[model samples]
Target: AIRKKLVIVGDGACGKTCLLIVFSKDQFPEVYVPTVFENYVADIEVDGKQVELALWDTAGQEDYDRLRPLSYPDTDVILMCFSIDSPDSLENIPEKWTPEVKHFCPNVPIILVGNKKDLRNDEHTRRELAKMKQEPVKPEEGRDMANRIGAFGYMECSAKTKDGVREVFEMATRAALQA
Candidate 1:
């Protein structure tokens, strides 16, 4: 197989690490706190075609904003991931990620991934959000977001249960190939 770089970016603790590991390693990992930048590689098959991808995970805190663009150059695609449980993360697509990626790597293909699908409908998580007078991001919202930002595609997944995990990579692989 061959390879290309796919940089994943968003606010911290949005499950970027969990999402990538599940796709690249095919299992849920009990990872600790996130920080800094790291790369994971995976050989993915889409409709009998193979794509080798270098998954770059970037720090998403405003504090790490200065360093995020360092990973932008030479990227084949971008995964703009957000936790399904966080509405603000979705809001940041236009507020931050789109502007940042376009500024440094204009025309780079992007895939918006709504991660942590398992928690979206969970009572515990819903209750938590209700307390704040907010709610989990719906799939329709994700689709609207992709359209607003001109993303290549939009989908949801849960790294914990492995739901929609492979599909996310399948779409990313295709986007990277097209780019």
Candidate 2:
């Protein structure tokens, strides 16, 4: 039996939990309470091979800092997620998430994922960021950050639309297998 573990970390409300839930169940959650998750495992097939995937969802809220790292042990890959519409979350990749993951799982491969891809070109999303003198994180930016953090891949997906969601896990499986 092939079993691998994956852990996701990012800023609060940056959509890490949303992406995980969508990938696991094929549904978008209307209300997400980020701090209450335990752990989940799913039977996943990637490229015709059966692989067991264990997912760890961590709270990005400041209050849960002491509780999040407890999920890091034995992780094979890390999904360093950020919202496409939130520039600050991307900024934290280099400053916060990258540093923390490296500290805890330095040998693990990190996958830089931009969540909420559906909002990248949306009118409301654009206008909302523009009001704050910001814009969505582009693919180039995501790629650059991945390179900066030594991530194995950079991917963008919309949990709401279900695009590239499977690709994220597929690539993750590839990363884990190679590691």
Q: List ranges where model 1 is wrong by over 4 Å.
A: 30-37, 60-62
Q: How many residue pairs clash in each candidate?
A: 0, 0
Report how far residue 90 has shifted in candidate 2, in Å. Answer: 0.6
| Model 1, TM vs. native | 0.90
Q: How far is 114's C-alpha from truth in model 2 (Å)?
A: 0.5
Worst 10 residues of 1 by lDDT: 29-38
| Residue clash pairs of candidate 2 | none
What is the Cα-based TM-score of model 2? 0.91
Give the per-residue lDDT digits (tens) of candidate 2, residues 68-168: 78888999999998999998888888888887888989889989999998897799999999999999999899999999888888999998888999999
Best by TM-score: 2
